[PDB]
Amino acid sequence: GGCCSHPACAANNQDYC
Numbered sequence: 001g002g003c004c005s006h007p008a009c010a011a012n013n014q015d016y017c
Contacts, residue, residue: 010017
């Protein structure tokens, strides 16, 4: 349960990651 755990998600959620 983490966005930063997923490179794809991280780049899509720059505020988060």
